[PDB]
Design an enzyme around this catalytic site. Structure first.
Site, PDB file in Angstrom:
ATOM      1  N   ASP A  13      -3.704   8.593  16.311  1.00 41.89           N
ATOM      2  CA  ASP A  13      -4.312   8.249  15.031  1.00 41.89           C
ATOM      3  C   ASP A  13      -4.926   6.859  15.126  1.00 41.89           C
ATOM      4  OD1 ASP A  13      -5.066   7.514  12.456  1.00 41.89           O
ATOM      5  OD2 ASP A  13      -3.064   7.676  11.591  1.00 41.89           O
ATOM      6  N   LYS A  32       7.840 -13.788   6.043  1.00 40.10           N
ATOM      7  CA  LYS A  32       7.147 -12.720   5.335  1.00 40.10           C
ATOM      8  C   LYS A  32       6.912 -11.553   6.284  1.00 40.10           C
ATOM      9  CE  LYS A  32       5.499 -11.669   1.270  1.00 40.10           C
ATOM     10  NZ  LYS A  32       6.455 -11.566   0.133  1.00 40.10           N
ATOM     11  N   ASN A  54      -6.004   1.935  10.507  1.00 41.59           N
ATOM     12  CA  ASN A  54      -4.740   1.612  11.159  1.00 41.59           C
ATOM     13  C   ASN A  54      -4.885   0.459  12.150  1.00 41.59           C
ATOM     14  OD1 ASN A  54      -4.639   5.125  11.307  1.00 41.59           O
ATOM     15  ND2 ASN A  54      -3.549   3.904   9.775  1.00 41.59           N
ATOM     16  N   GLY A  80       0.825  -1.190   0.000  1.00 46.19           N
ATOM     17  CA  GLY A  80       0.000   0.000   0.000  1.00 46.19           C
ATOM     18  C   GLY A  80       0.862   1.243   0.000  1.00 46.19           C
ATOM     19  N   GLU A  81       0.283   2.382   0.367  1.00 55.06           N
ATOM     20  CA  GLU A  81       1.025   3.628   0.500  1.00 55.06           C
ATOM     21  C   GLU A  81       0.755   4.193   1.883  1.00 55.06           C
ATOM     22  OE1 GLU A  81       2.945   5.089  -3.016  1.00 55.06           O
ATOM     23  OE2 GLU A  81       3.167   3.264  -1.819  1.00 55.06           O
ATOM     24  N   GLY A  82       1.804   4.291   2.692  1.00 49.84           N
ATOM     25  CA  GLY A  82       1.653   4.738   4.061  1.00 49.84           C
ATOM     26  C   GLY A  82       2.429   5.992   4.410  1.00 49.84           C
ATOM     27  N   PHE A 118       4.432   9.178   4.689  1.00 51.48           N
ATOM     28  CA  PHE A 118       5.539   9.629   3.850  1.00 51.48           C
ATOM     29  C   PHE A 118       6.416   8.477   3.379  1.00 51.48           C
ATOM     30  CE2 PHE A 118       6.799  10.049   8.331  1.00 51.48           C
ATOM     31  CZ  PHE A 118       8.037   9.438   8.377  1.00 51.48           C
ATOM     32  N   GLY A 119       5.782   7.409   2.921  1.00 48.97           N
ATOM     33  CA  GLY A 119       6.571   6.322   2.390  1.00 48.97           C
ATOM     34  C   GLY A 119       5.709   5.267   1.733  1.00 48.97           C
TER      35      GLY A 119
HETATM   36  C1  LIG Z   1       1.455  -0.667   8.201  1.00 46.67           C
HETATM   37  C2  LIG Z   1       1.172  -1.491   9.464  1.00 46.67           C
HETATM   38  C3  LIG Z   1       0.933  -2.966   9.113  1.00 46.67           C
HETATM   39  C4  LIG Z   1       1.944  -3.457   8.058  1.00 46.67           C
HETATM   40  N1  LIG Z   1       1.862  -4.917   7.897  1.00 46.67           N
HETATM   41  C5  LIG Z   1       1.047  -5.350   6.759  1.00 46.67           C
HETATM   42  N2  LIG Z   1       0.795  -6.629   6.542  1.00 46.67           N
HETATM   43  C6  LIG Z   1       0.052  -6.969   5.491  1.00 46.67           C
HETATM   44  C7  LIG Z   1      -0.472  -5.995   4.651  1.00 46.67           C
HETATM   45  C8  LIG Z   1      -1.338  -6.282   3.395  1.00 46.67           C
HETATM   46  O1  LIG Z   1      -1.553  -5.420   2.609  1.00 46.67           O
HETATM   47  N3  LIG Z   1      -1.910  -7.597   3.126  1.00 46.67           N
HETATM   48  C9  LIG Z   1      -2.665  -7.614   1.854  1.00 46.67           C
HETATM   49  C10 LIG Z   1      -2.295  -8.830   1.180  1.00 46.67           C
HETATM   50  C11 LIG Z   1      -3.240  -9.949   1.609  1.00 46.67           C
HETATM   51  N4  LIG Z   1      -4.558  -9.679   1.096  1.00 46.67           N
HETATM   52  C12 LIG Z   1      -4.651 -10.117  -0.020  1.00 46.67           C
HETATM   53  C13 LIG Z   1      -5.207 -11.543   0.061  1.00 46.67           C
HETATM   54  C14 LIG Z   1      -5.285 -12.170  -1.325  1.00 46.67           C
HETATM   55  F1  LIG Z   1      -4.099 -11.938  -1.961  1.00 46.67           F
HETATM   56  C15 LIG Z   1      -4.969  -8.293   1.156  1.00 46.67           C
HETATM   57  C16 LIG Z   1      -4.086  -7.418   2.057  1.00 46.67           C
HETATM   58  C17 LIG Z   1      -0.153  -4.690   4.930  1.00 46.67           C
HETATM   59  N5  LIG Z   1      -0.660  -3.642   4.086  1.00 46.67           N
HETATM   60  C18 LIG Z   1      -0.626  -2.331   4.715  1.00 46.67           C
HETATM   61  C19 LIG Z   1      -0.053  -1.318   3.717  1.00 46.67           C
HETATM   62  C20 LIG Z   1      -0.230   0.116   4.206  1.00 46.67           C
HETATM   63  C21 LIG Z   1      -1.685   0.393   4.598  1.00 46.67           C
HETATM   64  O2  LIG Z   1      -1.804   1.732   5.020  1.00 46.67           O
HETATM   65  C22 LIG Z   1      -2.171  -0.552   5.702  1.00 46.67           C
HETATM   66  C23 LIG Z   1      -2.028  -2.008   5.260  1.00 46.67           C
HETATM   67  N6  LIG Z   1       0.586  -4.389   5.977  1.00 46.67           N
END
Ligand SMILES: CCCCNc1ncc(C(=O)NC2CCN(CCCF)CC2)c(N[C@H]2CC[C@H](O)CC2)n1
Length: 263
Positions: A144, A39, A149, A18-20, A22-23
């Site tokens: 926040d 992972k 979040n 994703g986009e979080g 400032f990064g």
């Molecule tokens: C930032 C604090 C937590 C960071 N850990 C973390 N773990 C995992 C994910 C994640 O996207 N998992 C995806 C992949 C699995 N699913 C797909 C299933 C079928 F493929 C969908 C979601 C993650 N995305 C953040 C990216 C920034 C956002 O703002 C909050 C969420 N972040």
């Protein structure tokens, strides 16, 4: 502060998740002490040492926490590549179900998960309180809190992370004073987000209108088929005066109490 640093060579990056802030948030693998890779999620950035510090100050404080309903820190990493520039990284654990906000909306679709019942929805609320109770009892303000979040753990457990005007407490909009009760406000709106299954808060009213909207006594509406006891709980997180607001330690039990009363 050297136990938390992990050598960059033990980490490889993958696809952008994703986009979080400032990064960017990407996926990757981290080599552990016991051979096995893991992972993980990494937060990558520079604004002199003013964005580096504010980025590596959440990490230096978040690090030595322990709770199941609070996300944990696996390590921080420092890149230093190409032009003579250091770039930092925050190894966060991977969540294969993303954040609660997005997973709430998918439930509304056929391809998404099943219609989430109240107990499951009420359960998520219990988890957030537990973690928010933890950071409360040791004097940390989230500043926040929102289902955006709150990631979802593979055991269908929620955790709080990523340390928005519709979520600021009324007094914090004015006196610039964020306190543990300002969190209690945000947790109340986050309790609304979950009960609606992903509705943007305060429908009809717009972001600038919000201060006058609150100072006249207008809070969120009771959603369709949200229980009376549950709305009076999240309404109680909103009282005009912070000291009249209950605490995370009390919200949790009332929630834990309410869940038991259901089949
Ligand atoms: C930032 C604090 C937590 C960071 N850990 C973390 N773990 C995992 C994910 C994640 O996207 N998992 C995806 C992949 C699995 N699913 C797909 C299933 C079928 F493929 C969908 C979601 C993650 N995305 C953040 C990216 C920034 C956002 O703002 C909050 C969420 N972040």
């Amino acid at each position: 502060l050297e136990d938390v640093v992990i050598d960059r060579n033990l980490l490889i990056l993958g696809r952008i998740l994703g986009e979080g802030e400032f990064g960017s948030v990407m996926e990757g693998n981290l080599k552990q002490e016991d051979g096995t890779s893991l992972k993980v999620a990494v937060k990558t950035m520079n604004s002199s040492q003013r964005e580096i510090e504010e980025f590596l100050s959440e990490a230096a404080c978040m690090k030595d926490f322990s709770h199941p309903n609070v996300i944990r820190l696996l390590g921080v990493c420092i890149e230093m590549s190409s032009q003579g520039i250091p770039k930092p990284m925050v190894i966060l654990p991977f969540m294969k179900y993303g954040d609660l906000h997005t997973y709430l909306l998918y439930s509304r679709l056929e391809t998404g998960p099943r219609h989430i019942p109240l107990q499951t929805l009420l359960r998520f609320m219990v988890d957030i309180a537990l973690g928010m109770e933890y950071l409360s009892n040791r004097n940390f303000l989230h500043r926040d809190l929102a289902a955006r979040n709150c990631m979802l753990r593979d055991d269908m457990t929620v955790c709080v992370a990523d340390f928005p005007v519709k979520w600021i407490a009324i007094e914090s909009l004015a006196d610039r004073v964020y306190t543990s009760k300002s969190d209690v406000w945000a947790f109340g709106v986050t309790m609304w987000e979950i009960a609606t299954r992903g509705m943007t808060p305060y429908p009809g009213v717009q972001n600038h209108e919000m201060y006058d909207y609150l100072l006249h006594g207008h809070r969120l509406k009771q959603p369709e088929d949200c229980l009376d006891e549950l709305y009076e709980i999240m309404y109680s997180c909103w009282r005009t005066d912070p000291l009249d607001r209950p605490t995370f330690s009390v919200l949790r039990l009332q929630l834990e109490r309410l869940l038991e009363s259901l089949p």
